[PDB]
Amino acid sequence: ARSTNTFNYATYHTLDEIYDFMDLLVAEHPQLVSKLQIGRSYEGRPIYVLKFSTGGSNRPAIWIDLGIHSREWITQATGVWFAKKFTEDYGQDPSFTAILDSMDIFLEIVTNPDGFAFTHSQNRLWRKTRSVTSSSLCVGVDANRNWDAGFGKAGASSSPCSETYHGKYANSEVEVKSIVDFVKDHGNFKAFLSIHSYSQLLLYPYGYTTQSIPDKTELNQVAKSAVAALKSLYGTSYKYGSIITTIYQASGGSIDWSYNQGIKYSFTFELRDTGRYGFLLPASQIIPTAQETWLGVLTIMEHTVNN
């Protein structure tokens, strides 16, 4: 256990193992990767983002978050694989090299660390944050119903004990506010991808309203192209479309907020599978899932650099 070359990418890891992995990666590739702390979780754990960059200052950027819902383990595992992949392909793959030569990538592998630690020690299916709610015996907020986009509208719950509880007010969760503040302060994000599981869907805005986004034709074509690239490897079938027309109303979601902040290429991926194993996806599917998802993500990044 001395390098990222001996790390086991084909198994699920604990929070500490993932945080340790980030430090190893930074130690091995200091000229390409840096670890930023953008805030703390409710319970006090650091919230880290890896910044991949070849230079410049405030270059156009791509945001990718994983694990905002703690039980979706395939997402944190895919994030760890992505981090290593970026360091292997820069300078080797012509397309990825061109992207990193012009844009920075910010990767948040464990967006909800308190919930992630809770899924390892007490409840494997925990989805929410672990914030304490006064007046309630229930804990946590659905961090993907806490954003300032149609906040509080249908598609979320005002019940603290609900799995889709939206919280007292928009950005009440420090895990969410941390990203909001970082993205707004940076001000030059061009793409915002939030990774979840499961269902095998690639979605664009909106989830809170049936109104079509002005960029619907373009984003729809980008999603169609990304799903085709993804499918080419193992034949995995994904559907794509707007959130509301594909999986129904959902309010306070992250990509609806990012699109409304002017970040055009805002998409959410729902990875494998479609329900056979669900959240308990076998570890043997980690690498194949990461590899095919990479093709879809790269396709989207290629479209942003050229746009």
**Binding site members:** 69-72, 127, 144-145, 196-198, 248
DSSP H or E run through 242: strand 239-242
| CA 120 and chain centroid, separation | 20
Annotated binding site for substrate: 69-72, 127, 144-145, 197-198, 248
Q: Name the catalytic one among 108, 175, 270, 302.
A: 270
Q: Catalytic annotation on 270?
A: yes
User: Contact 149/256 with Cβ under 8 angstroms?
Assistant: yes
Nearest approach, Cβ of 29 to Zn ion (angstroms)?
30
Binding residues for Zn(2+) are 69, 72, 196
- The yes or no reply on residue 145 touching Zn ion (CB under 5 A) is no
Using alpha carbons, select from 161, 125, 164 the residue that is nearest to residue 248.
Answer: 164
Give min distance, CB of 256 to Zn ion, in A: 14
- Residue 15 or 271 having the CB closest to Zn ion: 271
- In the bound complex, what is the minimum distance in angstroms from residue 253's beta carbon to Zn ion? 10
| Comparison of 130 and 196: residue with beta carbon closer to Zn ion | 196
Cα–Cα dist 9/283, whole Å: 9
Nearer of residues 63 and 86 to Zn ion, judged by Cβ: 63
Residue 307, helix vs strand vs coil: coil
| Distance from C-alpha of 232 to C-alpha of 41, rounded to nearest angstrom | 38
Q: Any idea which residue has 């899932």 for tokens?
A: 289
CA–CA gap between residue 22 and residue 102 (Å, rounded)? 23
Q: Of 190 and 196, which has the nearer Cβ to Zn ion?
A: 196
Span 183-222, contacts to Zn ion by CB under 5 A: 196
Q: Which residues pair with 107 in a beta bridge?
A: 50, 64
Smallest distance from Zn ion to CB 273, Å: 14
Residue 57 near residue 104, CB atoms below 8 Å: no
Which residues 40-99 are close enough to bind Zn ion by CB under 5 A? Answer: 69
Long-range contacts of 273-282 (CB under 8 A, 24+ apart): 273/198, 273/200, 274/198, 274/199, 274/200, 275/198, 275/199, 278/198, 279/71, 279/72, 279/73, 279/124, 279/125, 279/197, 279/198, 280/124, 281/73, 281/74, 281/197, 281/198
Identity of the residue, 72 or 292, whose beta carbon is nearer to Zn ion in the bound complex: 72
Q: Binding mask 220-259 vs Zn ion (x if CB under 5 A, - otherwise)?
A: ----------------------------------------
**How many residues sit in the footprint of Zn ion (CB under 5 A)?**
2
C-alpha distances (whole Å) from 36 to each of 173, 188, 227 are 19, 17, 31
Residue 164 Cβ vs Zn ion, minimum distance, rounded to whole Å: 10
- Nearer Cβ to Zn ion (124/186): 124
Beta-carbon neighbour count of residue 171 at 10 Å? 19
Q: Which amino acid is at 264?
A: K
Least Å from the CB of residue 162 to Zn ion: 15
Which residues contribute to the site for Zn ion (CB under 5 A)?
69, 196
Catalytic positions: 270
